[PDB]
Amino acid sequence: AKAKTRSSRAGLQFPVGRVHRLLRKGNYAERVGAGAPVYLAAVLEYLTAEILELAGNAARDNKKTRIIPRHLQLAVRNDEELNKLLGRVTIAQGGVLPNIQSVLLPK
């Protein structure tokens, strides 16, 4: 794609300059492989792409252009396997998933 700015060479958006710094001044292990931050930036970009895609989808389905945290909870919790990765976490300012247990409805 390019030859400068090592993320350009892998053709990504997430930086491999910042990640490769943060894998050595974070004390995860002694010597960080030079392939390693690339693969790590590839996984991070993929998740940030997947969670921004389902967020944006639920923003047009509520007629709004930009994305507010209420959309991010709906993107995560309505998903089957992004909710499971984010199971214990709590998104600030981010509502609840609407559900009502069945016996609470009238009949």
Partner 1 sequence: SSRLNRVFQRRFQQDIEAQRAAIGFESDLLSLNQLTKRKKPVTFARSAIHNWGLYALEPIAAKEMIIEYVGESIRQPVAEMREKRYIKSGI
Partner 2 sequence: TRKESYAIYVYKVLKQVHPDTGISSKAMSIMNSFVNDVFERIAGEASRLAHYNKRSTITSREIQTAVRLLLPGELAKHAVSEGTKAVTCYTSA
Partner 3 sequence: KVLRDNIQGITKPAIRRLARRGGVKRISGLIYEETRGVLKVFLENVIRDAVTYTEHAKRKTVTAMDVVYALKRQGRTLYGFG
Q: Which residues bind partner 3 (CB under 8 A)?
A: 69, 88-93, 96, 99-101, 104
User: Residue 18 interacts with partner 2 (CB under 8 A)?
Assistant: yes
Interface residue with partner 2 among 4, 5, 51, 99 (CB under 8 A) is 51
* Residue linked to tokens 């700015």: 5
User: Residue 23 interacts with partner 2 (CB under 8 A)?
Assistant: yes
Choose one: 22-30, 33-41, 49-57, 83-91; the region binding partner 1 (CB under 8 A).
49-57
Q: Which of 18, 63, 51 is nearest to 37 (CA)?
A: 18
Task: Indicate which of partner 3, partner 2, partner 1, none lies near residue 100 (CB less than 5 to 8 Å, by partner kind).
Answer: partner 3
Q: Which of 19, 59, 68, 24 is nearest to 43 (CA)?
A: 19
Residue 12 φ/ψ, nearest 5 degrees = -120, 175
- How many residues lie near partner 2 (CB under 8 A)? 59
